[PDB]
Structures are given as structure tokens and as C-alpha cells.
Amino acid sequence: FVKQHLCGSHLVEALYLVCGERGFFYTPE
Amino acid sequence: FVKQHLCGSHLVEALYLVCGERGFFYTPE
Amino acid sequence: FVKQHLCGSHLVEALYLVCGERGFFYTPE
Amino acid sequence: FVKQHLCGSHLVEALYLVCGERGFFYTPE
Amino acid sequence: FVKQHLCGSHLVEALYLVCGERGFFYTPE
Amino acid sequence: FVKQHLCGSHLVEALYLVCGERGFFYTPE
Amino acid sequence: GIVEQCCTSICSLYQLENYCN
Amino acid sequence: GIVEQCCTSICSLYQLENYCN
Amino acid sequence: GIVEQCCTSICSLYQLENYCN
Amino acid sequence: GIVEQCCTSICSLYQLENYCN
Amino acid sequence: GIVEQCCTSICSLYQLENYCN
Amino acid sequence: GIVEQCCTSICSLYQLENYCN
Ligand SMILES: [Zn+2]
Ligand SMILES: [Zn+2]
């Protein structure tokens, strides 16, 4: 798995891919 | 606004557009 | 609703979210 | 190009890739 | 990670998140 | 068809649009 | 919950605001 | 129109060009 | 224009409603 | 192949790694 | 935070798992 | 390469066809 810059909408899309039905929290502060 | 029909990653996109960098919780039941 | 920078494809995706079946015009000039 | 099957926000994405910053009209009937 | 159900452009998005700028092959059969 | 900057995920989404079931190679080096 | 509702039914952007941090 | 066609049938990128500004 | 209002500056969904038909 | 599998069935991110360059 | 870890620096999918429920 | 042609410079869909199988 590559390490890359994941920002904004792309970052929450990646959280969706990895977490799916588990859900996630996006709390950038 | 128009009502929404949002499945899968499209809901996450919509949460990002509503909340942004405030952050949000994606919480399937 | 947060105010945020919405550009390019992300901006027309947001127009789709808000406008839907009403349609929209994207005319950046 | 290949023919397209494009529903919902996917059509908007395709219009942006065809038109870009020229702008475009998303006009459901 | 969660298992994936990925159709159309969503698979391409997932390949980009797995591979990134390493590159990848999208190869329907 | 407009000429525009297509980068990262947006570039592979455009490759999907144009190539579809033919498949494609994304090999940025 | 909201995730189910938005997919099986319809939902509002106003409802989505309740999920911000 | 085009929006319907692309979803219920198939459509061409050539058709989409008629919708640019 | 919309780019100035929403991309270079910032906007929320209410301003975007201005560009609906 | 993978493209079909991920859509008709389910697939793993581990499988997707075999498609990187 | 997640922005520092993944957006300004770089991360892969294993670090993203930290933000799943 | 494709990055030079399409991301740092500009391209349209005809150049992208070069990377189809
Ligand atoms: Zn983007
Ligand atoms: Zn989709």
C-alpha cells in the first residue's frame, strides 16, 4: 500500500474505503 | 435544497460538503 | 453549513448536491 | 471514445471533463 | 480492512488509493 | 473537448471515462 | 439511522448537519 | 433529454459537447 | 463570479443555490 | 478477473495490490 | 492529527484504520 | 509521460486515449 498525500474530500473517501460499515470519525481540528 | 438519495461513498461526499474541516461522524447502524 | 473553498470538479459536484433535478449552470468565465 | 452509461453525479463529472472551465449546463428534463 | 464492493469508477478510485503514483493497470476481462 | 490540468485521482477518473471496458494503464513514473 | 435513511429513502442536508463535529 | 438518455440508455462524449458554454 | 465567490473566497451551500435553475 | 469480481462479488484491498506498477 | 499525518505528511491505508470506529 | 502531458501541461480527451489498452 502506497503512502501518499490524502487531503479533504479525497481523505474522507479513503476513510470510507478502509472503514466502510464500521464507520469513522473525521476530526481535523 | 433538493432532497437527497445518497448511498455508499456519495453520503460521505455530502457530509464533507455540509461539514468540511469542522469534521464529521460517519456512523452506519 | 460550513463555508469552504470549492473548486473545479468539487464545485460542480456541490452544485449537483444542492440543485439536483432543478439543474444548474456552471459558467466560471 | 467508449460509449457512456452515466447516472446522477457521474454525468456532471463527465460534463466537467468534456467542458472544463469553459463551463456547462446540467439540464434534466 | 473491510471487504469491498466496487463497480465502475469506484474500482479505479480504490486502485489509485492502493497504488498511487506507483501506477496501476485497470484491466477488465 | 477542452484541454485542462488533470492530476491524480482526477486523471485516472478521466482515463476511466475515455477508456472504460478497454482498460488502461496509469504509469506516471 | 441516517446512513440507512439516505440510501433506502431520502434525506435532507439539514439532517446531515447533525453529524458535524 | 441528455440527462435521461445517459442514464437509461447510453450516450456519447460527442453529445455532451453540445452542453458546454 | 462563482469562482471568486466559492473557490478563491469561501461559500456554503446557500450561495450555491444561486446557480440552480 | 478482479474488475468483475469486485462488482459481482466482493474483493479485498490485498487483491488490488497485485495490479500496481 | 489526521491532517498532519496524512495530508501534509503522507500515510497509507494502515494509518487510516486508526480513525475507524 | 502522462503527468507531464496532462497534469503539469494540459490535455483533452484525445491524448488520454493513448493510455487505453
Ligand atoms: Zn479532487
Ligand atoms: Zn457512484
Numbering used by the authors:
A (entry chain B), B (entry chain D), C (entry chain B), D (entry chain D), E (entry chain D), F (entry chain B): 1 to 29
G (entry chain I), H (entry chain I), I (entry chain G), J (entry chain I), K (entry chain G), L (entry chain G): 1 to 21
What are the paper's exact sentences on this?
Insulin glulisine (IGlu) is a rapid-acting insulin analogue, which differs from human insulin, where the asparagine at position B3 is replaced by lysine and lysine in position B29 is replaced by glutamic acid. IGlu, like human insulin, is formed of two chains, stabilised with two inter-chain, and one intra-chain, disulfide bridges, commonly referred to as A and B1. IGlu, the recombinant human insulin analogue, has been reported to reduce the propensity to form hexamers (a stable, but ineffective form) and remain as monomers (the effective form), thereby making it a fast-acting analogue. The structural changes of IGlu, namely the replacement of the amino acid asparagine at position B3 by lysine and the replacement of lysine in position B29 by glutamic acid, are what effects the rapid-acting nature of this insulin.
The X-ray diffraction data demonstrates that the IGlu crystal belongs to the H3 space group with hexagonal (centred trigonal) cell dimensions a = b = 82.44 Å and c = 33.65 Å, and angles 90, 90, 120 degrees with two molecules in the asymmetric unit cell (we refer below to Mol1 consisting of chain A and chain B and Mol2 consisting of chains C and D). The IGlu B-chain N-terminus is found in the T-state in the crystal. Positive and negative electron density around the side chains of residue B3 (in Mol1 and Mol2) confirmed that indeed this residue was mutated from Asn to Lys. As for the second mutation, Lys to Glu at position B29 the B29 mutation in Mol2 (which we label as D29) mutation was observed while in Mol1 it is not since the C-terminus of the B chain B29 and B30 (from B29 Cβ) is disordered. However, our IGlu crystal structure consists of a dimer in the asymmetric unit (space group H3) that assembles to a hexamer. Indeed, the anomalous difference Fourier electron density map shows a strong peak at each of the two binding sites, which matches the classical Zn and with occupancy slightly less than the classical 1/3. We note that the X-ray wavelength of 0.92 Å is on the high energy side of the zinc K edge at 1.283 Å (i.e. f″ is 2.1 electrons at that X-ray wavelength). This finding must mean that traces of zinc ions are present in the commercial, as supplied, formulation solution as no zinc was used in the crystallisation. The B3Lys mutation also induced subtle steric and electrostatic repulsion between the two monomer molecules. Figure 5b shows D3Lys in about 5 Å distance to a symmetry B22Arg that contribute to the electrostatic repulsion as both are positively charged (protein–protein electrostatic interactions carrying a charge can occur between molecules that are positioned up to 10 Å distance away from each other). Thirdly, the unique conformation of D21Glu now points to the core of the protein rather than outside towards the solvent, increasing dimer interactions, “pulling” the C-terminus closer so that D29Glu could make a hydrogen bond to the C1Gly N atom.
